[PDB]
Write a protein that binds this ligand. Structure first.
Ligand SMILES: Cc1cc(O)c2cc(F)ccc2n1
Length: 291
């Protein structure tokens, strides 16, 4: 269990960013690692087999906006990025989850197109294949996996921001609606901790949110927990050693550098570190320290 870092890839502040930086909760340190080959915001990160993957996003730059179909793999042992097979379609403001060593890419946008499509990556074969689409088009969608079921939470369908959520049952290749959240949220941070899917922050169509609610997959209810100290949309999120970490985002005024940590035992959030610069739209995952 020792030696794991929280990696943050990409993001946005004025333009899309190429940063890869890793935070060590055991000593408070940050390391700057190899830049992404292409700057991107609105991407997702995940880890399979100790490799970090950056999935989708968009390169917002002075000279244009390019939605990304890219899958890139970072090996901490070499501090190098390598291209992997690209997805079927560009997906900005994507959500990603891992089931049994396979990466699911969910939703996202391509220009004015809001995807319901979903595809699955097989690392051993370096291949993507489309699976059943969601019941709803969703960009800015939060995704997490619990008990080998994939959840897609909130987002924006092209007309409305969503409180709805749905679950993918892989053995049936089928999506079904679940209980909707109490709050409309696009660009929330979504993760799994114990037996619940958490949705933290986001944007409800009027304000960036500090509220946090969790879906108990047994009782099918959403319950609010303690709110974050900061309102934030387009935050990064991950779980590490039984606690939720939220990174950056936008509070309606500032691109935040603050990282908060949720302790479920005490139902409290505390500020644990700051990123080296404020940013939103990062991808986040946990794996072993590099080199
Ligand atoms: C106001 C605002 C907030 C974001 O979180 C953004 C993220 C992006 F990737 C690009 C633009 C953005 N603008």
């Amino acid at each position: 269990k020792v030696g794991r870092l929280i990696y943050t890839a990409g993001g946005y502040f004025r333009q899309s960013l190429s940063y890869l930086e890793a935070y060590n909760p055991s000593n408070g340190s940050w390391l700057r690692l190899a830049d992404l080959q292409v700057p991107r915001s609105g991407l997702a990160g995940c880890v399979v087999g100790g490799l970090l993957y950056a999935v989708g996003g968009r390169n917002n730059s002075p000279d244009g906006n390019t939605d990304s179909s890219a899958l890139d793999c970072y090996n901490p042992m070499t501090n190098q990025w390598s291209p992997c097979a690209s997805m079927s379609v560009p997906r900005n403001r994507i959500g990603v989850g891992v089931i049994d060593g396979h990466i699911y890419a969910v939703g996202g946008s391509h220009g004015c197109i809001h995807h319901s499509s979903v595809e699955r990556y097989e690392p051993e074969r370096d291949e993507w294949h489309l699976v059943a689409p969601m019941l709803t088009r969703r960009i800015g969608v939060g995704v997490a996996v619990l008990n080998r079921l994939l959840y897609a939470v909130g987002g924006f369908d092209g007309t409305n921001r969503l409180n709805s959520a749905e679950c993918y049952y892989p053995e049936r290749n089928e999506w079904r609606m679940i209980t909707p959240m109490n709050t409309i949220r696009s660009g929330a941070g979504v993760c799994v901790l114990h037996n619940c899917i958490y949705a933290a922050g986001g944007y409800d169509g009027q304000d960036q949110l500090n509220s946090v609610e969790r879906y108990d997959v047994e009782t099918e209810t959403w319950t609010f927990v303690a709110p974050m100290r900061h309102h934030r949309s387009a935050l990064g999120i991950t779980v590490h050693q039984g606690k939720i970490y939220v990174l950056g985002g936008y509070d309606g005024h500032t691109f935040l550098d603050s990282v908060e940590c949720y302790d479920p035992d005490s139902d409290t959030w505390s500020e644990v570190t700051r990123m080296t610069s404020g940013r939103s739209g990062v991808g986040v995952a946990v794996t072993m320290e590099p080199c």
